[PDB]
Design a protein around this ligand. Sequence first.
Ligand SMILES: [Zn+2]
Ligand SMILES: [Zn+2]
Lengths: 79, 149, 273, 119, 56, 92, 245, 103
Amino acid sequence: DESAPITAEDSWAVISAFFREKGLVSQQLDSFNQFVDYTLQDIICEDSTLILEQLAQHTTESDNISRKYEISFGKIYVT
Amino acid sequence: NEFPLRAIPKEDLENMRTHLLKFQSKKKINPVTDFHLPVRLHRKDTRNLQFQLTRAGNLRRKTRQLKVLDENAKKLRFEEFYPWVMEDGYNTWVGSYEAGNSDSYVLLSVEDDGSFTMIPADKVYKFTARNKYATLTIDEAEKRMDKKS
Amino acid sequence: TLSHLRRTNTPIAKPRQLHNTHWGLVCPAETPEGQACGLVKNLSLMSCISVGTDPMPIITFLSEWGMEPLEDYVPHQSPDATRVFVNGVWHGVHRNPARLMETLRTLRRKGDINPEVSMIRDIREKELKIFTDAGRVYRPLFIVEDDESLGHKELKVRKGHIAKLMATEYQDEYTWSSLLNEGLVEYIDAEEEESILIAMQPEDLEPAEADVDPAKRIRVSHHATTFTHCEIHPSMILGVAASIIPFPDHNQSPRNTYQSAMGKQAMGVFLTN
Amino acid sequence: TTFRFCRDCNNMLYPREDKENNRLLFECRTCSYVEEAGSPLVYRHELITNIGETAGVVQDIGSDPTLPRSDRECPKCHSRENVFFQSQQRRKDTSMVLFFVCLSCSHIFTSDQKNKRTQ
Amino acid sequence: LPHFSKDDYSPESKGFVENSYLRGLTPQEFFFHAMGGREGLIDTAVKTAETGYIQR
Amino acid sequence: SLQQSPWLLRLELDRAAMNDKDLTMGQVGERIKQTFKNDLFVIWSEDNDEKLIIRCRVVAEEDHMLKKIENTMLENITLRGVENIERVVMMK
Amino acid sequence: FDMGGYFIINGSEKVLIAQERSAGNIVQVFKKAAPSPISHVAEIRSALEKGSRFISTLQVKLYGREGSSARTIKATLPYIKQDIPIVIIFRALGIIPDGEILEHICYDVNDWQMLEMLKPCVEDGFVIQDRETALDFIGRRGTALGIKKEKRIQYAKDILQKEFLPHITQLEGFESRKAFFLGYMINRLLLCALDRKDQDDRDHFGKKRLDLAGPLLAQLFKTLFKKLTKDIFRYMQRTVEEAHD
Amino acid sequence: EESLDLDLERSNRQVWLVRLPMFLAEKWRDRNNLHGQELGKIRINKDSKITLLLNENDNDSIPHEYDLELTKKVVENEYVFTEQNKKTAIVGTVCHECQVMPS
Ligand SMILES: [Zn+2]
Ligand SMILES: [Zn+2]
């Protein structure tokens, strides 16, 4: 009879399990965790890399030298 | 409870001296090859070169006084539009490459021996009447070079 | 402390009123008196808020399951086409939504599609909107299926699962997640709530009629044969503060609203440390 | 009403009177296209509308659990299985007349005991 | 509420609390009484400052 | 029995509505006739006749002209009553 | 018994309060009150899930009131002073002939009622006949104006790509997608004006979002990281000038 | 012969081809083909059901049948043109479009 319909008192056994797992502030914690594990990385990667280019006067040495420097942001760590 | 079945062997040749591409026409332009007799398909190099302005102690300049130079941008030969001229007086179409992820529809072709051979679609081009197209302005040309690369 | 970690602020049509859509998501009694009245919402016990998932596994799934892309739509050719949206982005159309909707629902109830993802099918409007979106308030409900060899439409959860849980209750292997992946229970946000039909009590609102106590309150019926879901427990519509009110069903509406404000100022042991 | 477009342009058609043969035409204001009119009716206003009442009646109408059922015998197949709703024309005035959709023949019958319909 | 069928103009659907306080309210009765109850708290709250300024 | 535009403005009136706000086809028609004077030719179906109709014609380019005439007709033509005075209830 | 969910800043416990906002990327139709030229508006608060977050709200306005002649449909585009008649927008998008435009708005060829309601718009956009002339008309109406023919047509391109319907895509070749959407919006605008649908409930909880501790920190960290990013750049200039390592 | 001329032979003898969307995982297995380059069988069963099944050697795996979802190529006209290692030619007109569904 393990496939018998559930009574009204049985709904509490489910509610017990909901709280055993989630607790009373699952919203507060689940939000923060999502931000630390994922959101944080994506914020570091949207604009991320920034470049500065130094293009010369093309007169003669020491001119005629065009350069571009990069600065990149990879994985994010959190102690 | 009865089915008629036809089964065909499929080969995917690593050997191949050809690249298979798609030539697509819009239903509104009503293209009918029957009227075709001779056709010329050639690349469009009108926009071979393109010069784009590029930004070049003292304090950094305000935006209104930033200094610039120029850079020559080379269009990938494979990133040039196709130009289709049908029947000498007649129809003319411009084919623009479809922008897409690195995935490609396979073309299944029947061989004389009866089996199918499948090949990856190299490029997909949308062709439309040249009258819908206008001489590319510097702005559009620059915008195009970027899309492609 | 508890009720402070479930508090909601609304800055700046008729916001202060208790909306029907607030059912099971926000406490009908726990709100301040004066200036902030009805602009400071308090979450019901079983309410959770969508963390925000990725839309691509669903967009990739859709196209593969009969979804014609908008880029190739021809309105008069397929004129009855159900328009499909994923986060207010119209992705294309589908010819047999009936079967697609069932596939997507089975995908969620299995776990393949995340349970916090909201998917609604407005038949009359010919629309299927999907939300992977962050910030949506949801509540868990029991699933009811016409699906029962023996008889009528019956709640998936059976007395066997109940003992299977109380076995784990005595251990302190069958969690809440276990009910969720076994597709016995589901998460329903307010937009999705629009398309469902809920029973309050399971047992009292399931088998039809084939003396009566006068002291008990006057109750309605299980006339519906359409029931898609059942209420875990109606008392769960209440927030932390209102949940200490004894017999709140026997008090005048605001007297309850008052207690869920005073108990916050009642002395006692706040923490053992 | 139900209006046409220009074949060639696909652009809409504007009515022109052929003063000589006293007849109505439809001209294209983008090309030189002209076609004679199908009906003499060019414009219909319609203030007291009835179009909206039985909207969104997809054959899947039965799959909405939110819809209520009744044991009313169908005028066609005589089936006591049907879903019902009120005039979907979201106006203030609107009567509380009910539209029943058969869970077999799909025929739309009403509860209107003042008037007789076909929609 | 989602516990009702569409186009339900019945007393039970549109907020008629059939029961006494002594008997107790059904969840539906409870929530509707709560909506109606909230309305009064809103005017009590607002009226308070509107009424004050009129006096001034 | 007991010159004009080939374009016709035909409007159907509601018998039920024509009664609650007591009105005759004659009196309705008279207002239109007296509004547009001798620059609009009006005819009307009798109060007895099944459908309630008013046929109107003017006295190159006429399509837009009539669409203005129908707007004037619906929005500006006052049949009975005083302006600003709507919903009048009788009370004992 | 302590349940967590707070921070510890300088020794006092702090709780982020969930903030309630209206969900974005959502089509909503509202009747604009008795004294107004515009009778109904279709609004979409378009914003990105992440990345800059362009809070550009597109309004699709039904000019003229219930009983006014020439009821036109114009739409206020981000960075454009005037409201452009829907038709010109579709033309600037690439959907050039009427009826091809109408197909994107009205989905039933039978529905004469909605279609008659589109005739004024077609008349309004009759002046502009190709994609180019449509972009110029959009480009003319600034901005500021930004005088020069090549400049204004090049500017219209950018607005439609970057500021018009930024969800969906901000990419290039997606005119088809943004056209069908605009058409879905006009469909909803007219559906409400034809009294077939109800005005959107601004108070439906399903249309509201709650910004919790996660997104709140994300909002702050964005503006705080772009604050750091552009302070490093200010340094890379200072240190490339004097080669100061 | 004359450069620029699109050899319209393929379209003149009206050769038809199929355009099929293939899951990336399946085309990756095809890549491991050897011998004569065979990868499997295309089956068309009528009473119409079209499907593709990998052969025993290529799959190295339990047998599966990839169903095809037939689609219309109506809204437009598609043709195939090839460019050899330099001649251009319209080898065929897409007579059928289909999607090979993962399975
Ligand atoms: Zn024309
Ligand atoms: Zn029937």
